[PDB]
Amino acid sequence: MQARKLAVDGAIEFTPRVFADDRGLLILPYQEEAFVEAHGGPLFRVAQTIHSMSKRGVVRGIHYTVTPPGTAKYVYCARGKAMDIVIDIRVGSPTFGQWDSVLMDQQDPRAVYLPVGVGHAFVALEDDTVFSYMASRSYVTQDELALSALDPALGLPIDIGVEPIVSDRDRVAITLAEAQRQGLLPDYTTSQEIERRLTAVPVST
Amino acid sequence: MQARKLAVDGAIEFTPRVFADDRGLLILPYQEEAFVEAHGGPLFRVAQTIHSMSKRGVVRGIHYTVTPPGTAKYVYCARGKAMDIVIDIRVGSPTFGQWDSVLMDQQDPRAVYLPVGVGHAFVALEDDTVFSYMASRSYVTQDELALSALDPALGLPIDIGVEPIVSDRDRVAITLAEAQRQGLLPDYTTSQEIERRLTAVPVST
């Protein structure tokens, strides 16, 4: 397993090996040793998992969780192809306003660690594109917020030639800039504090 | 989410709802509230995840982990169709020697909790059949052991009309009965003790 610290502070791309034989395929998308060495502590406790499949041209995001409580996530692309995007929406962050992209696909599969307080978006490049998540918190539509993924100030790499396929909620999302004005965005310090508590190393005999 | 306690003591089948819209599909295969209510405690901490894809007619198993240390698992079928099988190999168990099957498929997806000390096997009924696991322990070929899934004393539902597609290791696996003779099988009491420590409820303020 290879790990690559992304430009968005604390975000990480992991590249598992694909082991192939006569029976099919085996991948180990999350691996404790590689993760602890990259991040400094183990994965959060898993409160919920998500299986999401999208059609070609679907754009989902930018999604984030009111912080506190916040959510940290670990996502891998289990089928199809996507441009995955971490957006740093944590006010105070050294990389605030920065985004990073990971090409997710079945030939060179990738997993992404998303810190507490960051936004997540992606575009599906193929039908039957599947994102598989572990999350540190169960989903409350409540605390779950959206920002405009098509926002021109952002220039996210989300256009693939065809009309984006988007939920009404994601389509009408306020901008990053508007959310900051209104004080709706995660704070970087708070986010970090929660994240360190979530991914605390177990300390035993 | 629905939960169904299986005949193999402590094993559980969970039935998530499939939410479908214009964009594709969403499923929440592991959910803390449903799991704690069925099992009595939360999922183990996640040490590793597994993405496995199989061709039609592939039989994998019966696999188990030397106990101690043991491994507990949570598996959902993310693509295709399978007959999934929990085998109770814990000597002392009230359901020792019993197996249970879950039909895994994309139309009515299912997740299975596998306790510490139980064996796991399945047959893929379609090409591109994907099993997605969280496990309480990272994989050591070491502590990872196999029993004969085609064993006639077992009568597992693993034949689909065509020659089974099997690893050399799984093909040459000793029987359940032979493993017991040799003292290679998990102990039920020990398994339970480990399981309770793994899935201990967090107790905070």
In chain A, whose CA is at the least distance from the CA of B167? A23
Distance from CA of A173 to the nearest CA of B (A): 17
Residue type, A21: D
Q: How was this structure determined?
A: X-ray
Resolution (A): 2.1
- Report helix, strand or coil for B204: coil
Residue type, A52: S
Radius of gyration in angstroms for the set of CA atoms belonging to chain B, rounded to a whole number:
17
Tokens found for residue B128: 């591109």
Note whether A110 and A12 are within 8 A (CB): no
Q: Which among B186, B62, B52, B61 is positioned nearest to B115, based on CA atoms?
A: B186
DSSP lists the bridge partners of residue B75 as B112, B133
Note whether B187 and B67 are within 8 A (CB): yes
**Sequence-distant (≥ 6) Cβ neighbours of residue A200 within 8 angstroms:** A41
Q: Do B76 and A51 touch (CB under 8 A)?
A: yes
Q: List residues forming the annotated binding site of B.
A: 23, 48, 139, 169
DSSP code, position B60: E
What are the catalytic residues of A?
Answer: 63, 133
Neighbouring CB atoms inside 10 A of A3's CB total 16
What are the catalytic residues of B?
Answer: 63, 133
Pick among A17, A23, A171 to test the B interface (most B CBs inside 10 A): A23
Residue A48 marked ligand-binding: yes
Residues on chain A touching B26 (C-beta within 8 angstroms): 50-52
Q: What is the DSSP string of chain A?
A: -EEEE-SSTT-EEEE--EEEETTEEEE---BHHHHHHHHSSPPPPP-EEEEEEE-TTBEEEEEEE-TTT---EEEEEEESEEEEEEE---BT-TTTT-EEEEEEESSS--EEEE-TT-EEEEEESSTTEEEEEEESS---TTTEEE--TT-TTT--S---SS--B--HHHHTPPPHHHHHHTT-SPBHHHHHHHHHHHTPPP---
Q: Do B51 and A139 touch (CB under 8 A)?
A: no
Tokens found for residue A63: 């999604």
Q: Do B32 and A58 touch (CB under 8 A)?
A: no
- Residue B66 to residue A157: CA distance in whole angstroms: 48
Distance from CA of A181 to the nearest CA of B (A): 31
Residues after which chain B has a gap (C–N > 2.5 Å): none
- Report helix, strand or coil for B183: coil
**Sequence-distant (≥ 6) Cβ neighbours of residue A193 within 8 angstroms:** none
Q: Residue holding tokens 């992991």?
A: A14
From residue A67, give the alpha-carbon distance in Å to each of A84, A164, B136. 22, 28, 29
Neighbouring CB atoms inside 10 A of A159's CB total 14
Q: Choose the CATH number for A1-205 among 3.60.15.10, 1.10.10.10, 2.60.120.10, 1.10.3720.10.
A: 2.60.120.10
- Residue A205 to residue B119: CA distance in whole angstroms: 29
Q: What is the DSSP string of B130-172?
A: EEEEEESS---TTTEEE--TT-TTT--S---SS--B--HHHHT
Q: Which among A54, A39, A96, A105 is positioned nearest to A76, based on CA atoms?
A: A105
Element containing residue B20 per DSSP (H, E): strand B18-21
Residues on chain B touching A50 (C-beta within 8 angstroms): 26-28
Note whether B187 and B90 are within 8 A (CB): yes
Q: Do A24 and B202 touch (CB under 8 A)?
A: no
Q: Do A138 and B26 touch (CB under 8 A)?
A: no
In chain A, whose CA is at the least distance from the CA of B134? A30
- Residue A2 to residue A17: CA distance in whole angstroms: 9
Q: Do A51 and B134 touch (CB under 8 A)?
A: no
Residues on chain B touching A24 (C-beta within 8 angstroms): 52-55, 58, 124, 129
